[PDB]
Amino acid sequence: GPSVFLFPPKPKDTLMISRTPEVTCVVVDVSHEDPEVKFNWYVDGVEVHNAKTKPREEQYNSTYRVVSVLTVLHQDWLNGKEYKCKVSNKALPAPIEKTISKAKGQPREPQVCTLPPSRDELTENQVSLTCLVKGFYPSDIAVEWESNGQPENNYKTTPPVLDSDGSFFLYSWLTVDKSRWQQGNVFSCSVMHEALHNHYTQKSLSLS
Amino acid sequence: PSVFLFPPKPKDTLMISRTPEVTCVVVDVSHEDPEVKFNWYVDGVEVHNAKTKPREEQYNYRVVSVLTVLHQDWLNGKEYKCKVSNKALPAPIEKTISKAKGQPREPRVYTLPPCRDELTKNQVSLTCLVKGFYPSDIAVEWESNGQPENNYKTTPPVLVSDGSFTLYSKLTVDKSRWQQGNVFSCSVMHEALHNHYTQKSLSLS
């Protein structure tokens, strides 16, 4: 029979004003004989009608995939509003309902430390600057780097890792030429998370 | 029926004394008396040492052939082919696996002391940076005073623009114990290391 999967918005979409956080309801394994899927969307139990439904697409596996996308309000998602996808189809005994929301757990603020390159790393031609982001909940977060008050690309960030606390940590790091580290330039680790004041903290780092 | 083919653990691959196992998993087989046949090959030659794990079905029926692989063959990236025959299939389904291709690059291992501000609290993070390795198959562990340390976490490998991989491993310890000059070590096993092993240590300065 049809299976239903309900996906949350991307972390960055929830945390950045200029972005569009979406909940996505995906229906798979829809037969040729019972191809119609009906969607009903609810927000804390109230039905809404502005969800955008895509037309069915036959997959290489000879089954249909149907998708409905509901745009979520930033503040609603962060206040724990529940989003319910209801799927109706005639190869089903009864409608399938799935509900998604922000993570239930008590929110915890990240702690953010900056770490200079290893002393042993100081022999090489390029150097790593490290940002440690610790003890946050939930795992939605975004990290960015800056130099000279201007955005810096070419950083990498690990996924959140479940820690024994129940909280999360991650590392982000920037690789720079050695000269640029030791001409005293300042670098910055920026973190956006729902539990920070103004959902933002910045911590910086420079040659000592 | 769907076929999934899985690689061995890094340590089993890197230690002479251990048995690296590749796993062929067939799921979604009918309890209409469909019975399954296996053909394993290695670079085109078929093999008969595969050893079927008994069954156990769970509610809603999966058969599993476990193939012990040669250490050097795996490190050379030989392709392990699980071929599955079943009537509820058009023709055999074949799945192929192998060490990631490409010349191996060793990690450069660095240890990093806790942040100055983290020294304001009761526990501290000791950090191990593992950089520029290929492929991503790796193992990391922590030691203190000649003994295993199990209160660490390790991030997944992350792909850098290099094509190589990076990770961090974090050990959490009481501040008090760090400030007694204790020594801690990050040990890393990877195929491009000499003896597939390196250790790096770190203690209060």
Ligand SMILES: *[C@@H]1O[C@H](CO[C@@H]2O[C@@H](C)[C@@H](O)[C@@H](O)[C@@H]2O)[C@@H](O[C@@H]2O[C@H](CO)[C@@H](O[C@@H]3O[C@H](CO[C@H]4O[C@H](CO)[C@@H](O)[C@H](O)[C@@H]4O[C@@H]4O[C@H](CO)[C@@H](O)[C@H](O)[C@H]4NC(C)=O)[C@@H](O)[C@H](O[C@H]4O[C@H](CO)[C@@H](O)[C@H](O)[C@@H]4O[C@@H]4O[C@H](CO)[C@@H](O)[C@H](O)[C@H]4NC(C)=O)[C@@H]3O)[C@H](O)[C@H]2NC(C)=O)[C@H](O)[C@H]1NC(C)=O
């Ligand atoms: C026929 O085809 C369709 C389509 O497949 C496509 O075409 C076929 C022909 C092939 O070519 C495929 O290669 C190709 O994908 C098949 O449909 C697939 O069906 C399976 C289930 O049978 C679905 O699996 C679910 O996948 C989700 C994760 O899926 C995300 O990640 C996949 C990346 O690997 C990606 O493919 C998916 O599209 C999806 O990607 C996300 O998409 C959203 C919206 O588009 C986007 O916002 C995201 O950013 C994007 N993410 C990424 C990374 O790109 C997985 O979570 C599901 O597992 C849950 O459920 C399992 C139960 O089945 C359970 O065991 C798991 O543990 C997990 O459980 C859930 O998760 C946690 C922990 O359990 C918990 O919080 C939840 O409560 C729990 N919920 C449960 C258990 O229900 C599951 O793996 C595929 O998504 C689906 N593919 C697509 C594209 O829809 C179809 O099956 C084919 N064949 C047949 C015979 O039907």
Ligand SMILES: *[C@@H]1O[C@H](CO[C@@H]2O[C@@H](C)[C@@H](O)[C@@H](O)[C@@H]2O)[C@@H](O[C@@H]2O[C@H](CO)[C@@H](O[C@@H]3O[C@H](CO[C@H]4O[C@H](CO)[C@@H](O)[C@H](O)[C@@H]4O[C@@H]4O[C@H](CO)[C@@H](O)[C@H](O)[C@H]4NC(C)=O)[C@@H](O)[C@H](O[C@H]4O[C@H](CO)[C@@H](O)[C@H](O)[C@@H]4O[C@@H]4O[C@H](CO)[C@@H](O)[C@H](O)[C@H]4NC(C)=O)[C@@H]3O)[C@H](O)[C@H]2NC(C)=O)[C@H](O)[C@H]1NC(C)=O
């Ligand atoms: C009936 O029930 C069975 C039973 O299922 C299990 O138990 C039941 C009771 C429920 O709890 C289930 O939710 C639970 O799964 C159902 O069988 C399941 O079927 C699905 C799909 O049919 C399979 O999902 C795939 O699984 C692999 C990962 O599996 C490992 O990780 C699992 C986490 O869920 C975990 O179960 C195990 O760890 C498992 O096994 C590894 O096993 C080896 C052998 O012992 C062991 O050494 C390892 O340690 C162990 N792993 C770990 C971490 O320990 C996952 O890879 C699949 O995703 C791949 O496939 C997707 C579909 O192809 C694809 O979209 C993904 O991207 C990915 O595919 C690879 O990636 C690309 C994309 O880049 C893709 O296009 C390619 O095809 C593919 N290859 C490459 C090179 O890229 C997916 O999650 C379940 O494994 C299977 N359950 C079991 C136990 O096998 C069954 O579905 C039910 N029947 C029906 C009709 O629904």
